[PDB]
């Protein structure tokens, strides 16, 4: 199918700061990916983003009850929906699972990548740190960053470049809002 | 200070495919979408529907307004069509692989438009549909789309996997490969 395509998008956005103390509502209209007109609760009326949105901003702003309704959206729509969804979204907590393994089987004294795989957690904000004999490694850390799985869980893989030697204990430490104390998983340096 | 959370009700309508979508997004995850064929709310996790309800029928009136607005903008733009943006495709497991222990392949399709793809899972070159699932098109802040496809599987040294994605911005189907080691 080579027929040209045309796409319309609308995004009704609620941005929440400090719980619901401060809320910003955005009513946004797009053609393909180009926003052409929007209502911003911080502005208080529709504004043309491109020249194609000028007829709609002028028309919608002339409808007084329509404008008052959109100006109240921070309460009737944003705050309401936050309240309804809070228990299973804002307050959703799922534990990370932490697995540690060397990327290759090597004798000691050879370079290697130690992998810290952190899986299944929610929410996304997380801190993963590498330690060698209790000392934090601030160098040689290679991270995928945060990976969204699409099913309300995340994963991240944090690797450490090192040369494992006899006696060393490497520790991956994870801090996460689901946890009351850091979760740690060790790999004691050993051949293969 | 930076925001703590964002809820987006995202809608689209696409011509000439006549495909519409209505969903809610929370911090990048789908709360629910409306099944346009069955006119019903589909919560992304079933438990959500034990805390909330949504009247699916009103979403269809929204999409009709979206369709009407699209036809206006199409004429207003002098029939300027969309530029195809091909997707990036990544295949990952959701958990560290253990041989002969169940796991899940995730096909992450990202940064594309228009929201139309054909996705097939291949095991040793044969299509697989047993237990597969997928999301609808998820909105991006740059107003492209994301999508996820899922394949439960039993890891083994003997099978290889591809996610095959067809998109009008690609010259050929894109295969993204996965195998143990």
């Amino acid at each position: 199918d080579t027929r040209p395509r045309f796409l319309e998008q609308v995004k009704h956005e609620c941005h929440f700061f400090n719980g619901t103390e401060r809320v910003r509502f955005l009513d946004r209209y797009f053609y393909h990916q180009e926003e052409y007109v929007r209502f911003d609760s911080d502005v208080g009326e529709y504004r043309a983003v491109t020249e194609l949105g000028r007829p709609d901003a002028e028309y919608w702003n002339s409808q007084k009850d329509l404008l008052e309704q959109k100006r109240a959206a921070v309460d009737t729509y944003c705050r309401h929906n936050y309240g309804v969804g809070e228990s299973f979204t804002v307050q959703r907590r799922v534990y990370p699972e932490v697995t540690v393994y060397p990327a290759k089987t090597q004798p000691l004294q050879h370079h290697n990548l130690l992998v810290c795989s952190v899986n299944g957690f929610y929410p996304g904000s997380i801190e993963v740190r590498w330690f060698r004999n209790g000392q934090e490694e601030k160098t040689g850390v290679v991270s995928t960053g945060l990976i969204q799985n699409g099913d309300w869980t995340f994963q991240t893989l944090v690797m450490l470049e090192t040369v494992p030697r006899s006696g060393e204990v490497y520790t991956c430490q994870v801090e996460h809002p689901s946890l009351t104390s850091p979760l740690t998983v060790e790999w004691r340096a050993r051949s293969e | 200070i930076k925001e703590e959370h964002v809820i987006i009700q995202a809608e689209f309508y696409l011509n000439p495919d006549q495909s519409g979508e209505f969903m809610f997004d929370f911090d990048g995850d789908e709360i629910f979408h409306v099944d346009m064929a069955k006119k019903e709310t589909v919560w992304r996790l079933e438990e959500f529907g034990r805390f909330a309800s949504f009247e699916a029928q009103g979403a269809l009136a929204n999409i009709a307004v979206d369709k009407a607005n699209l036809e206006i903008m199409t004429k207003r733009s002098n029939y300027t069509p969309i530029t195809n943006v091909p997707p990036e495709v990544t295949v990952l497991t959701n958990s560290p692989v253990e041989l002969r222990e169940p796991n899940v392949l995730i096909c992450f399709i990202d940064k594309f438009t228009p929201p139309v793809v054909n996705v097939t899972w291949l095991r040793n070159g044969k299509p697989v549909t047993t237990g597969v699932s997928e999301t609808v098109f998820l909105p991006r802040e740059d107003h492209l789309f994301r999508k996820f496809h899922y394949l439960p599987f039993l890891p083994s040294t003997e099978d290889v996997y591809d996610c095959r994605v067809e998109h009008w911005g690609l010259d050929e189907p894109l295969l993204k490969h996965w195998e143990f080691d």
Partner: peptide, 15 residues
Amino acid sequence: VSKMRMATPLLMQAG
């Protein structure tokens, strides 16, 4: 259960 509320898009001016 509580009900999630729907925002409505405005119909653009045609002609």
